[PDB]
Design an enzyme around this catalytic site. Structure first.
Site, PDB file in Angstrom:
ATOM      1  N   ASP A 168       0.734  -1.286  -0.295  1.00  0.00           N
ATOM      2  CA  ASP A 168      -0.289  -0.116  -0.253  1.00  0.00           C
ATOM      3  C   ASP A 168       0.901   1.369   0.119  1.00  0.00           C
ATOM      4  O   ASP A 168       0.942   1.677   0.918  1.00  0.00           O
ATOM      5  CB  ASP A 168      -0.476   0.179   1.497  1.00  0.00           C
ATOM      6  CG  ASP A 168      -2.036   0.899   1.888  1.00  0.00           C
ATOM      7  OD1 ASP A 168      -2.097   1.610  -0.433  1.00  0.00           O
ATOM      8  OD2 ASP A 168      -3.213   0.899   2.377  1.00  0.00           O
ATOM      9  N   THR A 169       0.931   1.552  -1.086  1.00  0.00           N
ATOM     10  CA  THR A 169       1.723   2.977  -1.544  1.00  0.00           C
ATOM     11  C   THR A 169       1.263   4.500  -0.800  1.00  0.00           C
ATOM     12  O   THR A 169       1.518   5.703  -0.387  1.00  0.00           O
ATOM     13  CB  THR A 169       1.863   3.497  -2.566  1.00  0.00           C
ATOM     14  OG1 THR A 169       0.993   3.658  -3.656  1.00  0.00           O
ATOM     15  CG2 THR A 169       3.122   2.031  -3.089  1.00  0.00           C
ATOM     16  N   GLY A 170      -0.382   4.326  -0.885  1.00  0.00           N
ATOM     17  CA  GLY A 170      -1.093   4.902   0.000  1.00  0.00           C
ATOM     18  C   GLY A 170      -1.193   5.014   1.473  1.00  0.00           C
ATOM     19  O   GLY A 170      -1.596   5.768   2.411  1.00  0.00           O
TER      20      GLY A 170
END
Lengths: 99, 99
Positions: free
Chosen positions: A25-27
């Site tokens: 999850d880059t967020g």
């Protein structure tokens, strides 16, 4: 590996002798896992915040294997609607987004 | 580009003549932008769901430029804590996670 994004980027992780799955999850700034135990000292941390914060346990310097790659970093244990590998561990992997 | 993950992966976007910013979020299935208008027909879509769903407007086949790369896809307009580029547009970019 090279992971395409047609599907949710769920990978196998190994942590504290426990085999689990988690979403890359880059967020997410931080890593949060629900379904594991870890030994030793921790520090309380508040996450979330919209409608209230959630208290979780911060474990430091945790050895974790992500898709076969061994790294060390911070792991938060507490409720999360899905196990999340956040940027804190993706930087330890050397992971980049490429296009 | 090659984007490292030491900071949040926020990129410039251009959509419907509006210059904005958004987060490249591999943990998001869909793209959601708050601070733009789009022309023409849309369809209602429910997103979220934990504590209730949020109604947004789905716009199809939208031309959007992400960090200088032109693609076409679906854009949801409605409230979001941050503008998000989801996997629906990152697959149109050919974007991969690499480590």
């Amino acid at each position: 590996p090279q992971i395409t994004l047609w599907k949710r980027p769920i990978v196998t992780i190994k942590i504290g002798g426990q085999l689990r799955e988690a979403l890359l999850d880059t967020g997410a700034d931080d890593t949060v896992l629900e379904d594991i135990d870890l030994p030793g000292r921790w520090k309380p941390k508040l996450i979330g915040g919209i409608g209230g914060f959630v208290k979780v346990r911060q474990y430091e310097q945790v050895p974790i294997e992500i898709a076969g790659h061994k790294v060390v970093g911070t792991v938060l244990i507490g409720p999360t609607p899905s196990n999340i590998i956040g940027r804190n561990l993706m930087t330890q992997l050397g992971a980049t987004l490429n296009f």
